[PDB]
PDB file of C-alpha atoms and ligand atoms in Angstrom:
ATOM      1  CA  UNK X   1       4.119  -8.243  -2.534  1.00 61.25           C
ATOM      2  CA  UNK X   2       3.720 -11.333  -4.728  1.00 58.14           C
ATOM      3  CA  UNK X   3       6.018 -14.089  -3.434  1.00 55.48           C
ATOM      4  CA  UNK X   4       5.792 -13.013   0.215  1.00 57.67           C
ATOM      5  CA  UNK X   5       2.012 -12.597  -0.025  1.00 56.25           C
ATOM      6  CA  UNK X   6       1.669 -16.057  -1.579  1.00 59.04           C
ATOM      7  CA  UNK X   7       3.881 -17.575   1.128  1.00 57.58           C
ATOM      8  CA  UNK X   8       1.860 -15.901   3.892  1.00 52.70           C
ATOM      9  CA  UNK X   9      -1.454 -16.914   2.290  1.00 54.44           C
ATOM     10  CA  UNK X  10      -0.664 -20.638   2.833  1.00 55.76           C
ATOM     11  CA  UNK X  11      -3.610 -22.821   1.675  1.00 54.75           C
ATOM     12  CA  UNK X  12      -6.309 -20.219   2.393  1.00 55.07           C
ATOM     13  CA  UNK X  13      -5.800 -18.551  -0.995  1.00 53.79           C
ATOM     14  CA  UNK X  14      -5.763 -21.928  -2.774  1.00 53.60           C
ATOM     15  CA  UNK X  15      -9.149 -22.646  -1.197  1.00 54.56           C
ATOM     16  CA  UNK X  16     -10.785 -20.447  -3.830  1.00 53.53           C
ATOM     17  CA  UNK X  17      -9.130 -22.406  -6.651  1.00 54.73           C
ATOM     18  CA  UNK X  18     -10.078 -25.723  -5.037  1.00 53.12           C
ATOM     19  CA  UNK X  19     -13.672 -24.516  -4.698  1.00 54.69           C
ATOM     20  CA  UNK X  20     -13.684 -23.429  -8.346  1.00 53.65           C
ATOM     21  CA  UNK X  21     -12.519 -26.924  -9.308  1.00 53.34           C
ATOM     22  CA  UNK X  22     -15.268 -28.388  -7.113  1.00 53.34           C
ATOM     23  CA  UNK X  23     -17.838 -26.126  -8.790  1.00 53.17           C
ATOM     24  CA  UNK X  24     -16.645 -27.300 -12.207  1.00 53.19           C
ATOM     25  CA  UNK X  25     -16.980 -30.899 -11.004  1.00 49.88           C
ATOM     26  CA  UNK X  26     -20.509 -30.165  -9.757  1.00 54.71           C
ATOM     27  CA  UNK X  27     -21.270 -28.727 -13.193  1.00 55.00           C
ATOM     28  CA  UNK X  28     -20.078 -32.108 -14.450  1.00 49.86           C
ATOM     29  CA  UNK X  29     -21.973 -33.471 -11.399  1.00 48.08           C
ATOM     30  CA  UNK X  30     -19.441 -36.283 -10.936  1.00 52.63           C
ATOM     31  CA  UNK X  31     -21.134 -39.680 -10.975  1.00 51.98           C
ATOM     32  CA  UNK X  32     -24.318 -38.576 -12.754  1.00 52.30           C
ATOM     33  CA  UNK X  33     -25.415 -35.306 -14.374  1.00 52.98           C
ATOM     34  CA  UNK X  34     -28.399 -34.708 -12.100  1.00 52.53           C
ATOM     35  CA  UNK X  35     -29.562 -32.078  -9.625  1.00 52.80           C
ATOM     36  CA  UNK X  36     -32.010 -31.726  -6.765  1.00 50.04           C
ATOM     37  CA  UNK X  37     -31.981 -31.616  -2.957  1.00 50.11           C
ATOM     38  CA  UNK X  38     -28.553 -33.030  -2.087  1.00 51.29           C
ATOM     39  CA  UNK X  39     -26.958 -31.136  -4.988  1.00 48.83           C
ATOM     40  CA  UNK X  40     -28.121 -27.805  -3.574  1.00 49.32           C
ATOM     41  CA  UNK X  41     -27.028 -28.988  -0.120  1.00 48.32           C
ATOM     42  CA  UNK X  42     -23.454 -29.750  -1.187  1.00 48.98           C
ATOM     43  CA  UNK X  43     -23.305 -26.528  -3.218  1.00 48.69           C
ATOM     44  CA  UNK X  44     -24.374 -24.532  -0.158  1.00 48.28           C
ATOM     45  CA  UNK X  45     -21.786 -26.435   1.886  1.00 47.18           C
ATOM     46  CA  UNK X  46     -18.889 -25.615  -0.411  1.00 48.28           C
ATOM     47  CA  UNK X  47     -20.070 -21.998  -0.633  1.00 47.11           C
ATOM     48  CA  UNK X  48     -19.868 -21.894   3.169  1.00 51.19           C
ATOM     49  CA  UNK X  49     -16.368 -23.367   2.864  1.00 50.54           C
ATOM     50  CA  UNK X  50     -15.521 -20.580   0.389  1.00 52.87           C
ATOM     51  CA  UNK X  51     -16.664 -17.932   2.857  1.00 50.48           C
ATOM     52  CA  UNK X  52     -14.819 -19.607   5.745  1.00 48.45           C
ATOM     53  CA  UNK X  53     -11.592 -19.582   3.724  1.00 54.01           C
ATOM     54  CA  UNK X  54     -12.164 -15.951   2.687  1.00 56.07           C
ATOM     55  CA  UNK X  55     -12.494 -15.072   6.368  1.00 57.37           C
ATOM     56  CA  UNK X  56      -8.945 -16.222   7.081  1.00 62.45           C
ATOM     57  CA  UNK X  57      -7.763 -14.716   3.782  1.00 64.00           C
ATOM     58  CA  UNK X  58      -8.923 -11.255   4.847  1.00 64.12           C
ATOM     59  CA  UNK X  59      -7.744 -11.899   8.417  1.00 61.19           C
ATOM     60  CA  UNK X  60      -4.198 -12.288   7.104  1.00 63.12           C
ATOM     61  CA  UNK X  61      -4.399  -9.209   4.842  1.00 64.98           C
ATOM     62  CA  UNK X  62      -4.819  -6.689   7.652  1.00 68.24           C
ATOM     63  CA  UNK X  63      -2.432  -8.627   9.905  1.00 69.68           C
ATOM     64  CA  UNK X  64       0.513  -8.679   7.475  1.00 70.05           C
ATOM     65  CA  UNK X  65       0.109  -5.189   5.941  1.00 69.75           C
ATOM     66  CA  UNK X  66      -1.839  -2.883   8.296  1.00 71.08           C
ATOM     67  CA  UNK X  67      -4.653  -3.270  10.834  1.00 76.19           C
ATOM     68  CA  UNK X  68      -6.486  -0.211   9.404  1.00 80.87           C
ATOM     69  CA  UNK X  69     -10.154  -0.057  10.533  1.00 84.54           C
ATOM     70  CA  UNK X  70     -11.802  -3.264   9.297  1.00 85.81           C
ATOM     71  CA  UNK X  71     -13.105  -4.341  12.748  1.00 87.58           C
ATOM     72  CA  UNK X  72     -13.527  -8.039  11.795  1.00 88.59           C
ATOM     73  CA  UNK X  73     -16.817  -8.152  13.682  1.00 85.90           C
ATOM     74  CA  UNK X  74     -18.511  -6.435  10.751  1.00 86.58           C
ATOM     75  CA  UNK X  75     -16.998  -8.776   8.146  1.00 81.92           C
ATOM     76  CA  UNK X  76     -18.060 -11.873  10.072  1.00 84.64           C
ATOM     77  CA  UNK X  77     -21.524 -10.330  10.422  1.00 85.27           C
ATOM     78  CA  UNK X  78     -21.542  -9.818   6.642  1.00 85.13           C
ATOM     79  CA  UNK X  79     -20.422 -13.404   6.023  1.00 85.47           C
ATOM     80  CA  UNK X  80     -23.162 -14.749   8.303  1.00 83.78           C
ATOM     81  CA  UNK X  81     -25.701 -12.551   6.503  1.00 85.68           C
ATOM     82  CA  UNK X  82     -24.553 -13.896   3.127  1.00 85.89           C
ATOM     83  CA  UNK X  83     -24.782 -17.479   4.409  1.00 86.76           C
ATOM     84  CA  UNK X  84     -28.318 -16.815   5.643  1.00 87.55           C
ATOM     85  CA  UNK X  85     -29.281 -15.234   2.312  1.00 88.36           C
TER      86      UNK X  85
ATOM     87  CA  UNK A   1      15.849 -33.609  13.252  1.00 87.20           C
ATOM     88  CA  UNK A   2      15.593 -37.363  13.852  1.00 87.05           C
ATOM     89  CA  UNK A   3      16.735 -38.141  17.407  1.00 88.40           C
ATOM     90  CA  UNK A   4      15.532 -34.832  18.865  1.00 87.80           C
ATOM     91  CA  UNK A   5      12.207 -35.099  17.021  1.00 91.54           C
ATOM     92  CA  UNK A   6      11.717 -38.654  18.296  1.00 91.04           C
ATOM     93  CA  UNK A   7      12.558 -37.576  21.853  1.00 90.27           C
ATOM     94  CA  UNK A   8      10.112 -34.658  21.678  1.00 90.18           C
ATOM     95  CA  UNK A   9       7.385 -36.841  20.137  1.00 86.29           C
ATOM     96  CA  UNK A  10       7.192 -38.982  23.325  1.00 87.71           C
ATOM     97  CA  UNK A  11       4.423 -41.631  23.002  1.00 86.32           C
ATOM     98  CA  UNK A  12       2.215 -39.580  20.661  1.00 85.75           C
ATOM     99  CA  UNK A  13       4.139 -40.756  17.588  1.00 87.40           C
ATOM    100  CA  UNK A  14       4.091 -44.373  18.807  1.00 87.32           C
ATOM    101  CA  UNK A  15       0.301 -44.109  19.023  1.00 87.13           C
ATOM    102  CA  UNK A  16       0.103 -44.599  15.260  1.00 82.88           C
ATOM    103  CA  UNK A  17       2.175 -47.794  15.458  1.00 82.91           C
ATOM    104  CA  UNK A  18       0.104 -49.072  18.388  1.00 84.08           C
ATOM    105  CA  UNK A  19      -3.082 -48.358  16.433  1.00 83.78           C
ATOM    106  CA  UNK A  20      -1.668 -50.177  13.403  1.00 82.39           C
ATOM    107  CA  UNK A  21      -0.971 -53.182  15.633  1.00 81.26           C
ATOM    108  CA  UNK A  22      -4.525 -52.939  16.985  1.00 80.64           C
ATOM    109  CA  UNK A  23      -5.889 -52.805  13.428  1.00 79.70           C
ATOM    110  CA  UNK A  24      -3.890 -55.919  12.541  1.00 82.20           C
ATOM    111  CA  UNK A  25      -5.314 -57.623  15.638  1.00 85.62           C
ATOM    112  CA  UNK A  26      -8.835 -56.591  14.599  1.00 88.19           C
ATOM    113  CA  UNK A  27      -8.113 -58.091  11.181  1.00 87.08           C
ATOM    114  CA  UNK A  28      -7.270 -61.223  13.159  1.00 86.67           C
ATOM    115  CA  UNK A  29     -10.300 -60.215  15.295  1.00 88.10           C
ATOM    116  CA  UNK A  30      -8.679 -61.595  18.457  1.00 85.51           C
ATOM    117  CA  UNK A  31     -10.903 -64.173  20.132  1.00 86.53           C
ATOM    118  CA  UNK A  32     -13.029 -64.987  17.076  1.00 83.74           C
ATOM    119  CA  UNK A  33     -12.854 -63.956  13.413  1.00 85.30           C
ATOM    120  CA  UNK A  34     -16.241 -62.237  13.311  1.00 87.30           C
ATOM    121  CA  UNK A  35     -17.609 -58.767  12.620  1.00 85.09           C
ATOM    122  CA  UNK A  36     -20.745 -56.751  13.254  1.00 84.00           C
ATOM    123  CA  UNK A  37     -21.958 -53.980  15.569  1.00 79.26           C
ATOM    124  CA  UNK A  38     -19.366 -54.001  18.360  1.00 80.11           C
ATOM    125  CA  UNK A  39     -16.556 -54.562  15.842  1.00 81.16           C
ATOM    126  CA  UNK A  40     -17.435 -51.351  14.008  1.00 84.56           C
ATOM    127  CA  UNK A  41     -17.806 -49.626  17.385  1.00 84.29           C
ATOM    128  CA  UNK A  42     -14.309 -50.545  18.573  1.00 83.86           C
ATOM    129  CA  UNK A  43     -12.857 -49.710  15.148  1.00 79.60           C
ATOM    130  CA  UNK A  44     -14.459 -46.261  15.293  1.00 75.90           C
ATOM    131  CA  UNK A  45     -13.129 -45.881  18.841  1.00 79.62           C
ATOM    132  CA  UNK A  46      -9.532 -46.633  17.922  1.00 79.90           C
ATOM    133  CA  UNK A  47      -9.828 -44.380  14.862  1.00 81.20           C
ATOM    134  CA  UNK A  48     -10.881 -41.599  17.242  1.00 78.85           C
ATOM    135  CA  UNK A  49      -7.845 -42.486  19.365  1.00 78.71           C
ATOM    136  CA  UNK A  50      -5.689 -42.197  16.222  1.00 73.54           C
ATOM    137  CA  UNK A  51      -7.033 -38.718  15.523  1.00 71.32           C
ATOM    138  CA  UNK A  52      -6.622 -37.659  19.164  1.00 69.05           C
ATOM    139  CA  UNK A  53      -2.972 -38.737  19.087  1.00 67.95           C
ATOM    140  CA  UNK A  54      -2.433 -36.988  15.735  1.00 65.84           C
ATOM    141  CA  UNK A  55      -3.782 -33.806  17.308  1.00 65.79           C
ATOM    142  CA  UNK A  56      -0.974 -33.741  19.867  1.00 65.33           C
ATOM    143  CA  UNK A  57       1.510 -34.897  17.212  1.00 69.15           C
ATOM    144  CA  UNK A  58       0.776 -31.842  15.070  1.00 72.00           C
ATOM    145  CA  UNK A  59       0.552 -29.648  18.183  1.00 74.71           C
ATOM    146  CA  UNK A  60       4.180 -30.483  18.950  1.00 75.79           C
ATOM    147  CA  UNK A  61       5.357 -29.948  15.350  1.00 75.45           C
ATOM    148  CA  UNK A  62       4.540 -26.242  15.221  1.00 74.26           C
ATOM    149  CA  UNK A  63       5.609 -25.759  18.847  1.00 78.64           C
ATOM    150  CA  UNK A  64       9.120 -27.210  18.461  1.00 77.00           C
ATOM    151  CA  UNK A  65       9.951 -25.894  14.958  1.00 76.59           C
ATOM    152  CA  UNK A  66       7.833 -22.816  14.122  1.00 78.14           C
ATOM    153  CA  UNK A  67       4.320 -21.583  14.925  1.00 75.17           C
ATOM    154  CA  UNK A  68       3.713 -20.642  11.251  1.00 73.94           C
ATOM    155  CA  UNK A  69      -0.014 -20.112  10.483  1.00 70.52           C
ATOM    156  CA  UNK A  70      -1.763 -23.400  11.296  1.00 65.50           C
ATOM    157  CA  UNK A  71      -4.322 -21.849  13.707  1.00 65.16           C
ATOM    158  CA  UNK A  72      -5.133 -25.154  15.491  1.00 59.56           C
ATOM    159  CA  UNK A  73      -8.814 -24.237  15.521  1.00 58.21           C
ATOM    160  CA  UNK A  74      -9.063 -25.282  11.881  1.00 57.75           C
ATOM    161  CA  UNK A  75      -7.271 -28.605  12.422  1.00 62.30           C
ATOM    162  CA  UNK A  76      -9.505 -29.522  15.355  1.00 59.88           C
ATOM    163  CA  UNK A  77     -12.509 -28.550  13.224  1.00 55.77           C
ATOM    164  CA  UNK A  78     -11.171 -30.866  10.504  1.00 53.39           C
ATOM    165  CA  UNK A  79     -10.647 -33.697  12.995  1.00 52.93           C
ATOM    166  CA  UNK A  80     -14.197 -33.309  14.321  1.00 53.49           C
ATOM    167  CA  UNK A  81     -15.504 -33.304  10.742  1.00 53.97           C
ATOM    168  CA  UNK A  82     -13.595 -36.514   9.983  1.00 52.44           C
ATOM    169  CA  UNK A  83     -14.944 -38.139  13.156  1.00 54.88           C
ATOM    170  CA  UNK A  84     -18.482 -37.165  12.155  1.00 52.21           C
ATOM    171  CA  UNK A  85     -17.952 -38.513   8.630  1.00 51.69           C
TER     172      UNK A  85
HETATM  173  C1  LIG Y   1     -33.384 -26.488   8.692  1.00 54.28           C
HETATM  174  C2  LIG Y   1     -34.509 -27.516   8.679  1.00 54.28           C
HETATM  175  C3  LIG Y   1     -35.085 -27.747   7.286  1.00 54.28           C
HETATM  176  C4  LIG Y   1     -34.133 -28.458   6.333  1.00 54.28           C
HETATM  177  C5  LIG Y   1     -34.212 -29.974   6.439  1.00 54.28           C
HETATM  178  C6  LIG Y   1     -35.565 -30.550   6.035  1.00 54.28           C
HETATM  179  C7  LIG Y   1     -35.920 -30.265   4.582  1.00 54.28           C
HETATM  180  C8  LIG Y   1     -35.170 -31.123   3.569  1.00 54.28           C
HETATM  181  C9  LIG Y   1     -35.616 -30.854   2.138  1.00 54.28           C
HETATM  182  C10 LIG Y   1     -35.055 -31.827   1.108  1.00 54.28           C
HETATM  183  C11 LIG Y   1     -35.481 -33.266   1.372  1.00 54.28           C
HETATM  184  C12 LIG Y   1     -34.982 -34.259   0.328  1.00 54.28           C
HETATM  185  C13 LIG Y   1     -35.922 -34.375  -0.868  1.00 54.28           C
HETATM  186  C14 LIG Y   1     -35.352 -35.269  -1.957  1.00 54.28           C
HETATM  187  C15 LIG Y   1     -36.252 -35.410  -3.155  1.00 54.28           C
HETATM  188  O1  LIG Y   1     -36.247 -34.684  -4.117  1.00 54.28           O
HETATM  189  O2  LIG Y   1     -37.073 -36.450  -3.021  1.00 54.28           O
HETATM  190  C16 LIG Y   1     -38.343 -36.427  -3.681  1.00 54.28           C
HETATM  191  C17 LIG Y   1     -39.383 -36.301  -2.590  1.00 54.28           C
HETATM  192  O3  LIG Y   1     -40.259 -35.234  -2.945  1.00 54.28           O
HETATM  193  C18 LIG Y   1     -41.132 -34.816  -2.029  1.00 54.28           C
HETATM  194  O4  LIG Y   1     -42.262 -35.226  -1.969  1.00 54.28           O
HETATM  195  C19 LIG Y   1     -40.527 -33.795  -1.102  1.00 54.28           C
HETATM  196  C20 LIG Y   1     -40.251 -34.327   0.296  1.00 54.28           C
HETATM  197  C21 LIG Y   1     -39.587 -33.290   1.194  1.00 54.28           C
HETATM  198  C22 LIG Y   1     -40.596 -32.385   1.892  1.00 54.28           C
HETATM  199  C23 LIG Y   1     -39.980 -31.520   2.980  1.00 54.28           C
HETATM  200  C24 LIG Y   1     -41.019 -30.751   3.791  1.00 54.28           C
HETATM  201  C25 LIG Y   1     -40.423 -29.942   4.934  1.00 54.28           C
HETATM  202  C26 LIG Y   1     -41.474 -29.181   5.735  1.00 54.28           C
HETATM  203  C27 LIG Y   1     -40.889 -28.246   6.785  1.00 54.28           C
HETATM  204  C28 LIG Y   1     -40.161 -28.977   7.908  1.00 54.28           C
HETATM  205  C29 LIG Y   1     -39.643 -28.043   8.994  1.00 54.28           C
HETATM  206  C30 LIG Y   1     -38.803 -28.752  10.050  1.00 54.28           C
HETATM  207  C31 LIG Y   1     -38.551 -37.676  -4.514  1.00 54.28           C
HETATM  208  O5  LIG Y   1     -39.818 -38.222  -4.224  1.00 54.28           O
HETATM  209  P1  LIG Y   1     -40.979 -38.103  -5.382  1.00 54.28           P
HETATM  210  O6  LIG Y   1     -41.159 -36.668  -5.774  1.00 54.28           O
HETATM  211  O7  LIG Y   1     -40.757 -39.137  -6.443  1.00 54.28           O
HETATM  212  O8  LIG Y   1     -42.164 -38.581  -4.361  1.00 54.28           O
HETATM  213  C32 LIG Y   1     -43.476 -38.724  -4.886  1.00 54.28           C
HETATM  214  C33 LIG Y   1     -43.723 -40.184  -5.181  1.00 54.28           C
HETATM  215  N1  LIG Y   1     -43.603 -40.991  -3.976  1.00 54.28           N
HETATM  216  C1  LIG Y   2     -26.090 -42.302  18.808  1.00 54.45           C
HETATM  217  C2  LIG Y   2     -27.328 -43.146  19.086  1.00 54.45           C
HETATM  218  C3  LIG Y   2     -27.445 -44.351  18.160  1.00 54.45           C
HETATM  219  C4  LIG Y   2     -26.392 -45.424  18.406  1.00 54.45           C
HETATM  220  C5  LIG Y   2     -26.801 -46.419  19.483  1.00 54.45           C
HETATM  221  C6  LIG Y   2     -28.030 -47.246  19.122  1.00 54.45           C
HETATM  222  C7  LIG Y   2     -27.819 -48.109  17.886  1.00 54.45           C
HETATM  223  C8  LIG Y   2     -26.963 -49.349  18.121  1.00 54.45           C
HETATM  224  C9  LIG Y   2     -26.846 -50.219  16.876  1.00 54.45           C
HETATM  225  C10 LIG Y   2     -26.182 -51.570  17.109  1.00 54.45           C
HETATM  226  C11 LIG Y   2     -26.948 -52.434  18.102  1.00 54.45           C
HETATM  227  C12 LIG Y   2     -26.340 -53.816  18.317  1.00 54.45           C
HETATM  228  C13 LIG Y   2     -26.834 -54.839  17.299  1.00 54.45           C
HETATM  229  C14 LIG Y   2     -26.126 -56.176  17.443  1.00 54.45           C
HETATM  230  C15 LIG Y   2     -26.587 -57.214  16.456  1.00 54.45           C
HETATM  231  O1  LIG Y   2     -26.119 -57.385  15.359  1.00 54.45           O
HETATM  232  O2  LIG Y   2     -27.595 -57.931  16.947  1.00 54.45           O
HETATM  233  C16 LIG Y   2     -28.544 -58.512  16.046  1.00 54.45           C
HETATM  234  C17 LIG Y   2     -29.838 -57.761  16.255  1.00 54.45           C
HETATM  235  O3  LIG Y   2     -30.316 -57.354  14.973  1.00 54.45           O
HETATM  236  C18 LIG Y   2     -31.342 -56.505  14.935  1.00 54.45           C
HETATM  237  O4  LIG Y   2     -32.486 -56.866  14.832  1.00 54.45           O
HETATM  238  C19 LIG Y   2     -30.888 -55.073  15.039  1.00 54.45           C
HETATM  239  C20 LIG Y   2     -31.202 -54.428  16.380  1.00 54.45           C
HETATM  240  C21 LIG Y   2     -30.682 -53.000  16.477  1.00 54.45           C
HETATM  241  C22 LIG Y   2     -31.663 -51.977  15.916  1.00 54.45           C
HETATM  242  C23 LIG Y   2     -31.283 -50.538  16.232  1.00 54.45           C
HETATM  243  C24 LIG Y   2     -32.357 -49.534  15.825  1.00 54.45           C
HETATM  244  C25 LIG Y   2     -32.025 -48.098  16.207  1.00 54.45           C
HETATM  245  C26 LIG Y   2     -33.108 -47.108  15.793  1.00 54.45           C
HETATM  246  C27 LIG Y   2     -32.730 -45.652  16.025  1.00 54.45           C
HETATM  247  C28 LIG Y   2     -32.577 -45.294  17.500  1.00 54.45           C
HETATM  248  C29 LIG Y   2     -32.272 -43.820  17.731  1.00 54.45           C
HETATM  249  C30 LIG Y   2     -31.989 -43.483  19.190  1.00 54.45           C
HETATM  250  C31 LIG Y   2     -28.708 -59.997  16.305  1.00 54.45           C
HETATM  251  O5  LIG Y   2     -30.081 -60.304  16.389  1.00 54.45           O
HETATM  252  P1  LIG Y   2     -30.744 -61.159  15.150  1.00 54.45           P
HETATM  253  O6  LIG Y   2     -30.494 -60.450  13.854  1.00 54.45           O
HETATM  254  O7  LIG Y   2     -30.394 -62.609  15.280  1.00 54.45           O
HETATM  255  O8  LIG Y   2     -32.271 -60.894  15.675  1.00 54.45           O
HETATM  256  C32 LIG Y   2     -33.335 -61.500  14.955  1.00 54.45           C
HETATM  257  C33 LIG Y   2     -33.756 -62.756  15.682  1.00 54.45           C
HETATM  258  N1  LIG Y   2     -34.205 -62.456  17.032  1.00 54.45           N
END
């Protein structure tokens, strides 16, 4: 659905939009338009936040529609692999 | 509700008021109007007490009205992150 899916998503779905806003701010770089070290650190941090939110997003999808065969072990393994990469 | 919610809150809700009184006392600084080291330590301690009380406060909210989708793991992660910050 659309309204029911949005209601069940709670703030997990809005995490992607918040992270997009944060990425736009980092493109503006906030206080000063610079990059190096800490900039990459905070970018990696909010990417990890993106993946953490996506974990709950996909956790709700197979819980509110159908369990199917996702076996969330594999998706958390994939998320850890992406974080490592 | 108002009366039922207050009765179910017990002393967890009053923890915020007690901490506000303690913060006012620390602004008065009790024995002597000074700051440094131990002052920041006790302030951090009573902030941690604030967050610990808020944990039970929000634990009762979704237990007495509706479980919803809070997943208290994320809120305790957030509280630990705030304490670290
Ligand atoms: C997981 C564990 C690893 C991750 C944590 C440790 C690594 C952190 C890397 C970033 C450090 C912050 C650097 C900030 C920065 O750009 O500062 C420059 C320092 O440059 C420099 O000279 C670079 C200094 C950083 C070298 C890091 C070497 C790590 C070796 C492996 C450690 C393994 C544990 C400015 O200084 P400048 O360029 O103007 O300076 C020359 C004139 N004074
Ligand atoms: C978690 C683990 C870390 C937290 C615990 C350890 C840190 C505690 C920090 C606060 C210590 C209390 C300081 C009290 C204070 O203001 O005393 C002044 C001492 O100043 C000073 O000279 C500062 C002394 C404190 C230096 C602490 C250095 C810690 C280094 C990292 C340790 C990692 C383990 C007064 O003295 P004054 O200014 O009049 O003195 C100069 C003339 N005698």
